[PDB]
């Protein structure tokens, strides 16, 4: 059931912004590890005396990395005279965020029809305002409300090229890396209490609960009208034999925040071949692979969707498989992206639900918690 | 002239420590960009609840990257019960350093015969103490005094494997990258006033002024007895037509600090081939290459040291060449390592002064300021 109750017109995920200590080093690491091209910049070389911001792209996926300069460079500016390209940026907020949480996502940005109306409707329906609508070069409007923790939901709307004041990157510095990643599928938050978090976000967005089918968590998914903006939220389950990874997250993150980004690949086999080649030479590491019993058990579960060879290809790459009533999910998880056991990445590809493919086809892999446990037991033997 | 006036026995450069916001991302970027292997770690997985520290090595070059965890993880510890492997580490100091200066060098570490005596003699001779001698696992002693700005000179001495509490890295995560870099040749600081900085450091070390032969700077080099520890220091020259890069550094760094690290390569041609291949795929960028007139002028200057082909190889890679009365220097400079126009790297190789090669053979390339200017004028034509 989908009541299509969005209180304003939402289009697609637009970008994800990381708040960093040094944007250059994080952006270069991510570019190589994920196969994303340097696409745009806003920094001292573009006249921005406030923050350094570098944009990476792969298909429609946009990752923005931002760090503050010394406040002394902009000490004579006021908001009316700012050289910042992102007017919501604040030195103190950024330093406080990073000192509290370490490297992580500050903004989950969605494109909307009218960012001013989305902001107004959101706040009228309980959203805590974070940054008011600001019109950039009479061309783009940006506004921000609190999502959870210190993560904001950023609304962006365009009259008619990322943001004004950003410059396209010199193609000598823009190597055309591409490992197959194409868009953000979903963005997942960890909170201490799922109920109040769901009520708050669904309250100001009108997003509905997305249909699904002790492992340490309870979760639910909020979805826009066409179910292409997907925002799962997790809470810990306390008292388990194995400590909840959600609780570990909350401890090391100093509270609620974004847990993982799920990145859709148009060819998850190529993406994982390319990412795994680079794990130990600057890229990203992956979770330990499931035992071979897991891949023998795949024949009975998805043998009508994947051939034996395609199943063997999943086994070589450590890919997990889950199934809905409508489709099939291929997924895999990285180790944490930075020092703290907090944020990580998921690579996914979805099979089925052709109408275009409907959002969320095959679910989110919750069936893989039980399958992994069974598989671990069976391999013990 | 070398009076050999060291007030304590100094051996060689031991390591360089960067203070980071996220050590993982900086270390992975540097590993790929410079061809350094992940060699050791001290972090949550080794029981360190205080800081994440990752060691990269290439030959005898040791780069350490350290970032603080949430203080909450160690809030019950005191110094007698600390799980930090580097007892001088302090959360507040590290966050303050990084917020003030951005990514940069906190510690220039030299190995000495006895770190406790070096500390005591240094402080008796004017050094400002930063961290007192602490004996680690009855095996290593570490002590720190102020060098310039918020950079410390760290003394390390060994009774008889980096530091106790560090663990060797799993060789699955330890890819054997190597682009030819072999050791730290020199480490250069920028200060507002050269005179007082020289008097202070030479005062507590006994290091002597190393012999040499308007560009925006005055410089001098302090050297240990065998001239293998080399510490140049720069001050700006004000009022020049082109603003001093030293003054720009001081402004963007919020004061004095480490300007560049010069890394000796055993094969600078291979090192630059490998580094330039990776510049736009996560590595380091290099300064703009000098015009071809510079390389035509090399025949008259070093045609007795480099063949035409070896000169052409310098031209393909953008390598600079300078000459002393004793030897020849091949050098090249990276663009800044992070967001701010502050710290950068120099790659060097020295030719001549065979006895082993004496320290500082061929100088530091000061002749290349004038040669570059002449070369730029000639290419204008
Ligand atoms: C995240 C996820 C999903 C998922 O998408 C999802 C949604 O979209 C919405 C619905 C709810 C939900 O779940 C589905 C299936 C998953 C997983 C998943 O995450 N996982 C495994 C894991 O645990 N991944 C994170 C691992 O965390 C850590 C990794 C590495 C470390 C290394 C050293 C460490 C040292 C000290 C403490 C540490 C704590 C946590 C550490 C860690 C520590 C899995 O198996 N399935 C099968
Ligand atoms: C450093 C050095 C040595 C050297 O070893 C040395 C010693 O060992 C001890 C004795 C004193 C000394 O000198 C020798 C020769 C050098 C150089 C050297 O450094 N150079 C060129 C340059 O300038 N390298 C740093 C470039 O800084 C910047 C690079 C890139 C940017 C990009 C964007 C920017 C935007 C805005 C502001 C910026 C400010 C500064 C920016 C910058 C800015 C050179 O040519 N020779 C020839
Ligand atoms: Co997911
Ligand atoms: Co130098």
């Amino acid at each position: 059931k989908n009541p299509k109750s969005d209180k304003f017109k939402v289009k697609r995920f637009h970008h994800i912004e990381f708040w960093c200590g040094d944007a250059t080093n994080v952006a270069r690491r991510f570019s190589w590890g994920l196969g994303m091209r340097f696409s745009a910049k806003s920094d001292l070389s573009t006249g921005n005396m406030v923050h350094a911001s570098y944009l990476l792209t792969s298909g429609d996926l946009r990752f923005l990395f931002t760090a503050p300069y010394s406040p002394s460079l902009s000490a004579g500016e006021i908001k009316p005279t700012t050289t910042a390209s992102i007017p919501s940026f604040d030195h103190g907020s950024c330093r406080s965020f990073f000192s509290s949480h370490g490297l992580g996502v500050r903004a989950v940005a969605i494109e909307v029809e009218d960012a001013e109306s989305a902001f107004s409707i959101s706040v009228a329906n309980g959203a805590i305002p974070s940054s008011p609508p600001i019109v950039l070069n009479e061309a783009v409007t940006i506004a921000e409300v609190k999502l959870y923790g210190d993560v904001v939901l950023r609304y962006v709307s365009y009259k008619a090229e990322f943001l004004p004041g950003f410059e396209r990157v010199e193609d000598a510095s823009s190597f055309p890396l591409d490992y197959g990643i194409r868009r953000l599928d979903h963005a997942v938050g960890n909170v201490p209490e799922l109920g109040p978090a769901l009520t708050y976000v669904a309250g100001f967005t009108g997003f509905h609960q997305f249909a699904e089918f002790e492992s340490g968590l309870n979760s639910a998914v909020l979805a826009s009208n066409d179910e292409m903006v997907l925002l799962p939220i997790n809470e810990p389950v306390h008292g388990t034999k194995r400590k909840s990874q959600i609780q570990t997250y909350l401890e090391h993150n100093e509270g609620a925040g974004l847990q993982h980004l799920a990145l859709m690949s148009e060819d998850i086999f190529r993406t994982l071949r390319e990412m795994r080649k680079r794990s130990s030479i600057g890229g990203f590491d992956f979770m330990p692979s499931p035992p071979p019993t897991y891949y023998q058990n795949l024949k009975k579960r998805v043998g009508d969707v994947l051939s034996d060879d395609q199943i063997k290809e999943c086994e070589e790459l450590g890919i997990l498989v889950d199934r809905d009533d409508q489709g099939t999910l291929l997924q895999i998880f990285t180790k944490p992206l930075g020092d703290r056991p907090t944020i990580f990445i998921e690579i996914i590809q979805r099979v089925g639900c052709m109408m275009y493919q409907s959002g969320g086809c095959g679910g989110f892999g919750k069936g893989n918690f039980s399958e992994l446990f069974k598989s671990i037991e069976e391999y013990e033997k």
Side-chain angles (χ1 to χ4, degrees), chain A residues 2-158 160 162-213 215-241 243-298 301-311 313-325 327-355 357-365 367-372 375 378-379:
Chain A
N2 172 5
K4 300 197 161 142
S5 45
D6 290 359
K7 303 191 146 107
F8 43 88
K9 175 65 206 302
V10 170
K11 297 174 97 205
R12 297 286 184 270
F13 283 122
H14 191 268
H15 65 267
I16 296 297
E17 183 176 16
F18 295 82
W19 267 2
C20 305
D22 186 84
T24 289
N25 276 269
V26 181
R28 291 206 170 204
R29 194 285 185 102
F30 273 60
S31 174
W32 177 236
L34 289 154
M36 311 182 63
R37 324 180 163 175
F38 270 95
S39 286
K41 67 183 177 173
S42 172
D43 67 2
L44 294 167
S45 80
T46 70
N48 185 339
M49 308 294 108
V50 176
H51 58 96
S53 290
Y54 301 109
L55 182 75
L56 304 189
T57 61
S58 190
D60 292 332
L61 182 64
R62 302 183 185 93
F63 275 2
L64 183 69
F65 303 81
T66 297
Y69 291 128
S70 169
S72 66
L73 304 189
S74 61
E77 297 176 15
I78 53 171
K79 276 182 190 192
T81 67
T82 191
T83 59
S85 55
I86 301 172
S88 64
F89 183 84
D90 177 76
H91 287 103
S93 296
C94 187
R95 294 203 155 86
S96 184
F97 177 102
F98 193 89
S99 90
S100 176
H101 310 298
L103 169 72
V105 173
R106 165 59 171 189
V108 173
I110 57 169
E111 182 180 1
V112 297
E113 205 161 285
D114 179 350
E116 180 179 48
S117 58
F119 178 87
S120 295
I121 295 169
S122 294
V123 170
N125 284 275
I128 299 167
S130 192
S131 182
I134 299 145
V135 182
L136 308 167
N137 198 34
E138 313 173 60
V140 188
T141 301
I142 179 168
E144 301 175 9
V145 298
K146 299 193 179 193
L147 184 58
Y148 33 61
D150 296 318
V151 182
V152 300
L153 189 63
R154 173 179 288 152
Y155 303 135
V156 181
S157 64
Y158 293 83
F162 175 64
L163 294 180
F166 277 75
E167 295 185 10
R168 281 316 109 161
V169 165
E170 52 284 11
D171 225 299
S173 291
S174 183
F175 196 99
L177 293 175
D178 176 18
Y179 311 162
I181 294 166
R182 288 295 179 267
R183 66 176 187 95
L184 184 65
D185 184 270
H186 59 269
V188 177
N190 281 352
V191 297
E193 319 202 326
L194 176 60
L198 280 181
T199 302
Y200 167 69
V201 179
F204 77 78
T205 58
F207 291 169
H208 62 276
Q209 177 146 10
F210 181 97
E212 250 175 318
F213 61 55
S215 73
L217 64 91
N218 299 317
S219 60
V221 183
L222 293 177
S224 60
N225 276 0
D226 62 11
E227 308 194 317
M228 292 299 289
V229 168
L230 300 168
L231 296 174
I233 305 180
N234 308 320
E235 73 174 355
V237 174
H238 303 299
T240 42
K241 26 191 161 292
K243 181 182 186 179
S244 175
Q245 54 292 330
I246 312 305
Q247 183 62 29
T248 293
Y249 176 103
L250 296 169
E251 283 163 11
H252 288 257
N253 199 63
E254 295 189 9
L258 192 137
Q259 176 206 53
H260 76 271
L261 305 157
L263 316 182
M264 185 166 280
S265 172
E266 71 167 17
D267 184 351
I268 188 170
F269 295 160
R270 159 158 142 266
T271 297
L272 262 285
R273 285 191 309 261
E274 294 309 311
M275 290 187 71
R276 283 192 176 279
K277 279 201 277 226
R278 299 166 168 83
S279 293
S280 295
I281 56 169
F284 296 93
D285 300 337
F286 291 91
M287 282 295 106
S289 295
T293 60
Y294 180 92
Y295 292 98
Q296 182 68 36
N297 300 350
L298 280 181
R301 308 167 42 214
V302 294
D304 61 308
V305 180
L306 309 178
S307 79
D308 274 356
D309 292 300
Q310 285 146 21
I311 286 173
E313 211 163 349
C314 291
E315 184 180 49
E316 298 171 353
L317 300 170
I319 289 166
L320 316 181
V321 187
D322 203 16
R323 196 165 187 163
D324 249 0
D325 45 307
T328 301
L329 171 74
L330 309 178
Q331 64 185 167
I332 195 175
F333 298 95
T334 74
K335 292 197 176 169
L337 311 186
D339 291 339
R340 304 189 187 194
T342 51
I343 182 172
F344 53 95
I345 274 163
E346 176 183 2
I347 309 299
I348 66 155
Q349 187 162 18
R350 299 177 180 283
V351 190
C353 321
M354 299 308 298
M355 300 315 225
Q357 189 178 62
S358 69
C361 182
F364 300 87
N368 265 323
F369 288 125
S370 65
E371 282 299 324
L372 267 167
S375 148
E378 296 166 1
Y379 189 66

XYZ file of all heavy atoms in Angstrom, chain A residues 185-188 232 259-262 329 331 333 344 346 348 350 363-365, ligand 3:
156
model
N 20.712 4.692 -4.139
C 19.463 3.960 -3.982
C 18.755 4.296 -2.678
O 17.534 4.504 -2.683
C 19.723 2.461 -4.054
C 18.442 1.655 -4.000
O 18.021 1.303 -2.884
O 17.873 1.370 -5.076
N 19.486 4.350 -1.563
C 18.880 4.707 -0.291
C 19.962 5.148 0.684
O 21.147 4.873 0.498
C 18.032 3.561 0.292
C 18.763 2.275 0.548
N 18.859 1.270 -0.393
C 19.335 1.787 1.674
C 19.480 0.231 0.135
N 19.807 0.529 1.381
N 19.521 5.851 1.721
C 20.398 6.433 2.726
C 19.792 6.121 4.081
O 18.606 6.385 4.294
C 20.545 7.940 2.511
N 20.587 5.550 4.979
C 20.094 4.895 6.183
C 20.626 5.609 7.414
O 21.829 5.844 7.526
C 20.515 3.420 6.215
C 20.047 2.773 7.522
C 19.955 2.675 4.976
N 15.596 4.480 5.009
C 15.490 3.568 6.150
C 16.074 4.183 7.413
O 16.996 5.008 7.372
C 16.306 2.343 5.706
C 16.397 2.457 4.194
C 16.459 3.936 3.940
N 24.110 6.008 8.811
C 24.827 4.745 8.936
C 25.418 4.281 7.611
O 26.606 3.946 7.552
C 23.911 3.651 9.494
C 24.600 2.279 9.550
C 23.627 1.110 9.488
O 22.791 1.025 8.588
N 23.734 0.207 10.452
N 24.616 4.218 6.546
C 25.214 3.789 5.292
C 24.505 4.395 4.091
O 23.346 4.820 4.153
C 25.306 2.242 5.178
C 24.024 1.522 4.880
N 23.170 1.083 5.868
C 23.509 1.065 3.713
C 22.167 0.417 5.322
N 22.339 0.405 4.012
N 25.252 4.460 2.996
C 24.752 4.869 1.693
C 24.761 3.656 0.791
O 25.792 2.989 0.672
C 25.627 5.970 1.093
C 25.794 7.177 2.007
C 27.059 7.928 1.630
C 24.566 8.066 1.909
N 23.627 3.373 0.162
C 23.515 2.256 -0.770
C 23.570 2.800 -2.188
O 22.705 3.589 -2.587
C 22.224 1.482 -0.540
N 17.652 -8.805 -4.924
C 18.655 -7.814 -4.555
C 20.025 -8.480 -4.506
O 20.191 -9.519 -3.857
C 18.306 -7.179 -3.198
C 19.320 -6.258 -2.512
C 19.356 -4.920 -3.231
C 18.967 -6.050 -1.041
N 23.765 -7.450 -3.156
C 24.295 -6.412 -2.273
C 25.623 -6.839 -1.662
O 25.940 -8.026 -1.558
C 23.288 -6.075 -1.157
C 23.024 -7.251 -0.239
C 21.955 -7.006 0.811
O 21.482 -7.947 1.445
N 21.589 -5.741 1.022
N 28.629 -5.008 1.418
C 28.899 -3.918 2.346
C 30.391 -3.697 2.503
O 31.164 -4.655 2.632
C 28.266 -4.219 3.687
C 26.778 -4.328 3.606
C 26.163 -5.559 3.453
C 26.000 -3.188 3.613
C 24.786 -5.647 3.351
C 24.619 -3.269 3.504
C 24.018 -4.495 3.366
N 29.433 3.346 6.575
C 29.972 2.441 5.556
C 29.129 2.586 4.295
O 28.146 3.335 4.270
C 30.005 0.978 6.032
C 28.680 0.456 6.553
C 27.818 -0.244 5.721
C 28.320 0.636 7.878
C 26.607 -0.744 6.198
C 27.109 0.146 8.360
C 26.254 -0.548 7.515
N 27.148 0.508 0.947
C 26.589 -0.697 0.362
C 26.574 -0.519 -1.144
O 26.222 0.554 -1.638
C 25.179 -0.927 0.903
C 24.459 -2.106 0.283
C 23.041 -2.233 0.813
O 22.619 -1.386 1.633
O 22.329 -3.179 0.402
N 24.737 -2.120 -4.471
C 23.561 -2.933 -4.767
C 23.252 -2.910 -6.255
O 23.596 -1.977 -6.983
C 22.297 -2.484 -3.989
C 21.828 -1.099 -4.416
C 22.532 -2.491 -2.522
C 20.349 -0.947 -4.132
N 19.544 -4.285 -8.434
C 18.213 -4.850 -8.274
C 17.732 -5.463 -9.582
O 17.961 -4.908 -10.663
C 17.227 -3.782 -7.815
C 17.572 -3.145 -6.476
C 16.564 -2.060 -6.167
N 16.830 -1.388 -4.897
C 16.540 -1.905 -3.708
N 15.976 -3.102 -3.626
N 16.809 -1.223 -2.598
N 13.705 -5.286 -1.982
C 13.811 -4.980 -0.572
C 15.149 -4.398 -0.171
O 15.763 -3.646 -0.933
N 15.606 -4.734 1.037
C 16.834 -4.165 1.578
C 17.764 -5.229 2.148
O 18.805 -4.888 2.721
C 16.484 -3.094 2.618
C 15.677 -1.974 2.036
C 14.292 -2.061 1.962
C 16.300 -0.875 1.481
C 13.556 -1.056 1.385
C 15.570 0.138 0.906
C 14.185 0.043 0.850
N 17.447 -6.505 1.956
C 18.335 -7.573 2.354
C 18.172 -8.047 3.775
O 19.076 -8.708 4.298
Co 20.891 -1.012 2.723
